[PDB]
Amino acid sequence: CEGPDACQKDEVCVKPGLCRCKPGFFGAHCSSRCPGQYWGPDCRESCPCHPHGQCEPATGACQCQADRWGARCEFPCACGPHGRCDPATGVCHCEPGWWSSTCRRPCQCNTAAARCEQATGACVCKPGWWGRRCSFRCNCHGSPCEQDSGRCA
């Protein structure tokens, strides 16, 4: 891909005797960034998820805006501040201490809870604690135990 078919900087060898602008770029001096609807060398391939998103210039990986999700980043997210949106499904992932599908309700647990269950606010205990709100320590020489009974593991 060299010699008279050589490939000066800011381009890439697409085919062994050819060159095109490096991915994400185009123009007389391979200097302009592709518009969001394109990606790849010389804007030769389509970005499905524009607008409200762009594709990675080289690989084509969809990249939604933060509040967006879907196969085209077409849908907006419902997540509250304490919920990180999932660009594939719209699911809100709650930071520990939050629940509801929007991650807008705070857990009603003691400090030994690792988090709580998104649908119900049910406390999930750090290993070594039990109780409705993970109030109790296990009587199990450090092993974890069953949440309702304290029966060892």
Residue numbers in the entry: 57 to 209
What does the paper say about this structure?
Among them, two fragments (f1, 20–132aa and f2, 20–221aa) were crystallized and the crystals diffracted to 2.2 Å and 2.6 Å, respectively. The structure of f2 fragment was solved by molecular replacement using the structure of f1 fragment combined with the EGF-like fragments predicted by AlphaFold as phasing models and refined to 2.6 Å resolution. The crystal belongs to space group P4122 with one molecule per asymmetric unit. In the f2 crystal structure, the N-terminal region of SCARF1 (residue 20–56aa) and the C-terminal region (210–221aa) are largely missing, suggesting these regions are quite flexible, consistent with low electron density of the N-terminal end of the f1 crystal. Rest of the f2 fragment adopts a long-curved conformation with multiple EGF-like domains arranged in tandem. Interestingly, in the crystal of f2 fragment, although an asymmetric unit has only one molecule, the dimer related by the crystallographic twofold symmetry can be well superimposed with the dimer found in the asymmetric unit of f1 crystals, suggesting that dimerization occurs in a similar fashion for the two fragments in different crystal forms. At the dimeric interfaces of f1 and f2 fragments, hydrogen bonds are formed between S88 and Y94 of the monomers, and F82 and Y94 are also close to each other, thus may form π-π interaction. But the salt bridges are not found in f2 crystals, suggesting they are not required for dimerization. To identify the binding site for modified LDLs on the region identified above (133–221aa), we calculated the surface electrostatic potential of the region based on the crystal structure of f2 fragment and found a positively charged area in this region, which is mainly composed of two sites, one is R160 and R161 (Site 1), the other is R188 and R189 (Site 2). The triple or quadruple mutants, R160S/R161S/R188S, R160S/R188S/R189S, and R160S/R161S/R188S/R189S, where positive charges are largely removed for the two sites, almost lost binding activities with modified LDLs completely, suggesting these arginines are crucial for lipoprotein interaction and both sites contribute to the recognition.
SCARF1 (scavenger receptor class F member 1, SREC-1 or SR-F1) is a type I transmembrane protein that recognizes multiple endogenous and exogenous ligands such as modified low-density lipoproteins (LDLs) and is important for maintaining homeostasis and immunity. SCARF1 (MW, 86 kD) is a type I transmembrane protein that has a short signal peptide followed by a long extracellular region, a transmembrane helix, and a large cytoplasmic portion. Its ectodomain has three glycosylation sites and contains multiple EGF-like domains, which usually has a two-stranded β-sheet followed by a loop region and three conserved disulfide bonds. Here, we solve the crystal structures of the N-terminal fragments of human SCARF1, which show that SCARF1 forms homodimers and its epidermal growth factor (EGF)-like domains adopt a long-curved conformation.
